[PDB]
């Protein structure tokens, strides 16, 4: 019996917690003697202040204290972000406010003053009574007029952002010797993750001062490292506790001003502090994303093959870096080329500042915005060259042949180098088999008195190792069960299930008996976290050589327990059959026997100096094509997405049932970005989309009756097991394909630039009939 578990559809381990409601979330936590923090936020977009009136706030009963800026610029550093630095140069700042500075305000929703009261009702009751008089300054909003820079945000100025540049060989000759040279600029919409759980933090101090407990949800819960350094009380003593999270999409990823204010205030009062975000707040305070300006250029010959490709990008970072370091901007500038033959290139990314909510990293950050413009310049190019988008992408995709194809673009640091180590294979048979699966041609064939069709491709910077390591640990027990410690984090995508399978496979124990513990920094003093579709080959790779450390620790230890040497039958139950077929020793009894007999019955080998797990220089790049067909009502602005199918090649799907969730779910978040979601600021500076009535989240009825999934496990990469990151591959080309279809269905020019596609824009067909 060699029961296999990886690749199998097994129902999630997380399911029952969430279904019954036994699972606790950050907002669910209660601690006796709690104080409830409410935050007085900005009402100006750009303003310096004189704030001294919390008098009637301080004097309403039930309120224990009101925290001003002067409390917190103290010690009271300003929000550091970490490695990925060089640095070039420099950093400060942003970081955010970073904590309430008693001088200037750089966006509506910025923390200025925190109150502390007994119940959250009384907390904001006192928050109203706080008065701050403002000097309104001029307001910056357009990324392009940020750097043509009058109206400077920082008085030190403090050039807006960081300028990233990457460019191969001889693009001067690649362009100069081209027949069709194509220039167009694209604009992406400002939108984010907007998960269902708003941000929430609970801090309990151990006033014995020794320590501090944080049931806050800080999204690398092993980034106590920041709070520690900031508060100067490091590094244990800041012991983080595990909580379930209601979705993040990287939008919650990192340290916020709220996190430190609470932690500081908790420490210096010896009193537990609780914080729970407004949705409204979330819309003006939680990290933004997606807003770019994509000037692009192409070099093409009479064949239609690529020769040269690129110009400048303007990433609008909002007002501040927020562990939203060039990281994403650096990634974006690395992969606006995707999985194509691109002889040369010229990135000049301008990460810039405006009076908006500080930009973090939304699901597939910088790659939704880039694979849009890239596929919106390719579609446009087919208009002049004259012939099909299908057979353009078809023969200048990614020659292989070529593979390994060390590019092709830069000067390749994505995010460091060198890459693209595209050792993973056949670029094309995906697109080929993806349309041989099976329609596309079948309703390009349309009697089409309705409307039309679209395409788009997405490669992914999706195992950001991180580099070198990731920790893991497996433990067998006296009670039948198995325990797995990991540096992973259940944002709700099924890590605790995937790892259980990985361990199940290697240990020959049902994934039911295995439990997984994460984000509890007392058990797990070191872990990396969960971002950039990574946690399987990294943390699952940790789980493997952990479970593989026990099998030796056990099988070796079992040969000593009976007297048979390490050869037997073949050895799994999980237990130990020597011979064929006398006797046996179970895997748990082995562990139960290693008690206080001079020892210990467990493993945790990742890692040491010269790390473990080892994933270094080159990450895997998964690639995928999205296929869409839309109908449109022209007398109004309506549309009904008739068909949808994202198909992505990624070696070794670990859990097919759950990966389907990660593909479909993401794809919808893409349609949300493509046709519904935009943060609208009024020309003076105030946010307009603050409620849910304004910001449009896709609902059940409007979505495609099915997103089809075409994944194949050809060409496993060489990081055993040969698997890929898949938690982002849904949204990548969701924007471009929708756009192409809309332009194909009208039909004028293939000339759409700005997302989203509002119903007002989409009667420019009233023009067509006129």
């Amino acid at each position: 019996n060699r029961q296999a578990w990886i690749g199998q559809e097994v129902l999630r381990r997380e399911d029952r917690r969430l279904l019954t409601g036994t699972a606790t979330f950050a907002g669910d936590l209660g601690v006796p003697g709690q104080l409830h923090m409410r935050i007085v936020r900005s009402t100006q977009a750009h303003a310096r202040i004189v704030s001294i009136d919390a008098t009637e706030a301080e004097k309403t009963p039930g309120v224990r204290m009101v925290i001003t800026s002067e409390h917190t610029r103290h010690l009271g550093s300003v929000l550091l972000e970490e490695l990925g630095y060089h640095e070039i140069y420099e950093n400060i700042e942003d970081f955010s406010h970073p904590v309430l500075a008693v001088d200037k305000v750089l966006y509506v929703g910025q923390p200025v003053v925190a109150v502390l009261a007994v119940d959250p009702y009384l907390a904001e009751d006192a928050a109203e009574l706080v008065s701050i008089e403002y000097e309104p300054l001029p307001v910056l909003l357009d990324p392009e007029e940020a750097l043509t820079g009058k109206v400077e945000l920082f008085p030190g100025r403090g050039n807006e952002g960081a300028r990233i540049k990457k460019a191969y060989g001889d693009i001067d000759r690649a362009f100069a010797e081209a027949e069709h040279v194509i220039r167009h600029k694209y604009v992406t919409n400002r939108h984010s993750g907007v998960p269902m759980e708003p941000r929430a933090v609970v801090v309990q101090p151990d006033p014995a001062r020794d320590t501090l407990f944080i049931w806050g949800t800080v999204h690398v819960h092993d980034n106590r490292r920041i709070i520690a350094k900031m508060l100067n009380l490091p590094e244990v003593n800041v012991r983080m506790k595990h909580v379930e999270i209601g979705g993040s999409f990287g939008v919650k990823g990192g340290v916020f001003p709220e996190n430190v204010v609470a932690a500081w205030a908790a420490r210096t009062l010896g009193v537990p502090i609780k914080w729970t975000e407004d949705r409204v707040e979330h819309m003006t305070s939680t990290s933004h994303a997606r807003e770019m300006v994509h000037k692009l250029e192409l070099a093409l010959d009479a064949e239609g093959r690529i020769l040269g490709m690129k110009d400048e990008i303007f990433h609008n970072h909002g007002a501040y870096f927020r562990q939203a370091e060039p990281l994403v901007s650096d990634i974006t500038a690395g992969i606006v080329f995707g999985p194509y033959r691109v002889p040369a290139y010229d990135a000049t990314l301008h990460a810039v500042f405006t009076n908006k909510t500080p930009v973090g990293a939304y699901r597939a950050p910088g790659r939704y915005e880039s694979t849009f413009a890239r596929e919106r310049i390719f579609d446009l190019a087919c208009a002049e060259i004259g012939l099909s988008k299908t057979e353009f992408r078809r023969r200048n995709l990614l020659t292989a042949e070529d593979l390994p194809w060390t590019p092709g673009l830069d000067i390749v640091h994505e995010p460091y180098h060198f890459d693209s180590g595209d050792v993973v294979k056949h670029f094309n048979e995906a697109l080929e088999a993806a349309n041989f699966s099976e329609w596309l041609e079948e309703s390009k064939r349309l009697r089409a008195d309705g409307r039309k069709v679209g395409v788009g491709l997405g490669v992914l910077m999706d195992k950001a190792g991180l580099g070198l390591f990731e920790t893991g640990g497996v433990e067998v027990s006296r009670a039948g069960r198995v325990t797995v410690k990991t540096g992973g984090s259940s944002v709700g995508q099924g890590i605790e299930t995937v790892l259980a399978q990985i361990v199940a496979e290697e240990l020959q124990i049902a994934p039911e008996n295995i439990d997984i513990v994460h984000s509890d920094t007392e058990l797990i003093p070191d872990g990396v976290g969960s971002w950039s579709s990574r946690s399987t080959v990294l943390a699952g790779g940790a789980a493997r050589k952990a479970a593989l450390a026990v099998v030796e620790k056990a099988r070796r230890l079992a040969s000593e327990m009976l007297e048979a040497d390490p050869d037997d039958l073949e050895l799994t139950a999980g237990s130990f059959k020597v011979k064929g077929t006398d006797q046996q020793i179970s895997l748990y009894e082995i562990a139960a026997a290693r008690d206080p007999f001079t020892a210990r019955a467990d493993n945790d080998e990742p890692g040491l100096a010269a790390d473990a797990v080892y994933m270094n220089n080159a990450m895997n790049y998964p690639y995928g094509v999205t296929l869409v067909q839309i109908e449109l009502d022209p007398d109004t602005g309506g549309h009904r997405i008739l068909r949808f199918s994202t198909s992505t090649e990624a070696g070794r799907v670990i859990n097919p049932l759950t990966t389907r969730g990660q593909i479909i779910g993401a794809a919808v978040q893409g349609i949300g970005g493509a046709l519904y979601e935009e943060f609208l600021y009024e020309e003076d500076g105030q946010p307009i989309t603050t409620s849910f009535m304004d910001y449009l989240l896709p609902s059940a009825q409007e979505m495609p009756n099915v997103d089809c999934f075409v994944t194949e496990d050809a060409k496993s990469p060489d990081n055993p097991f040969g698997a890929k990151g898949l938690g982002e591959i849904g949204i990548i080309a969701a924007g471009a394909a929708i756009a192409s279809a809309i332009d194909d269905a009208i039909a004028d020019g293939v000339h759409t630039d700005r997302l989203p596609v509002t119903p007002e824009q989409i009667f420019s067909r009233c023009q067509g009939l006129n």
């Binding site: 269902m196 709700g492 059940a700």
Partner: protein, 160 residues
């Protein structure tokens, strides 16, 4: 200045407690009736999670002051499970991976509950979508939920 005494039935257990009028039902059902099962996402009758059974009708625990619920039956997601065995709705939701994060699970489940318990109707993919539509999710999106609900209604009725 003004306290109000609630006499409410929650998931069977009747409670008597004094609460200030302005506390919302959601906050009351989480404190101090520590039934964290009910979850709060939006703040104005949209997110869905909010949703609870009030007197048989699904309403938002979030657009109702706790005080308005006096002398009424209330049921939350905690009340589905009956002696270990997950209520079939919960089973098919896991059988079809109808949930990844957890938030949009009280909301949908409680919306679907009275619909389930009453003998009609069938729920086909189209009519299934319309049913859950009052609840938002940012993870699935719905495809599997719609697939999950349907499955629940087949083992319900035609059932071998």
């Amino acid at each position: 200045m003004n306290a109000f005494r609630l006499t409410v039935e929650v998931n069977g257990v009747t409670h008597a407690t004094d609460v200030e009028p302005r506390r919302l039902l959601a906050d009351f059902l989480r404190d101090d009736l520590h039934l964290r099962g009910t979850r709060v996402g939006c703040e104005h009758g949209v997110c869905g999670s909010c949703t609870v059974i009030l007197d048989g009708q699904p309403v938002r625990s979030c657009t109702v002051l706790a005080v308005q619920a006096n002398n009424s039956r209330i049921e939350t997601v905690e009340s589905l499970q009956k002696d270990g065995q997950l209520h079939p709705l919960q089973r098919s939701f896991s059988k079809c991976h109808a949930l990844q994060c957890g938030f949009c699970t009280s909301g949908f489940l409680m919306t679907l509950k009275p619909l389930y318990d009453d003998e009609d109707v069938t729920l086909d993919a189209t009519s299934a979508r319309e049913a859950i539509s009052g609840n938002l999710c940012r993870c699935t999106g719905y495809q599997q939920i719609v697939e999950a609900t349907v499955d629940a209604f087949h083992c319900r009725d035609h059932n071998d």
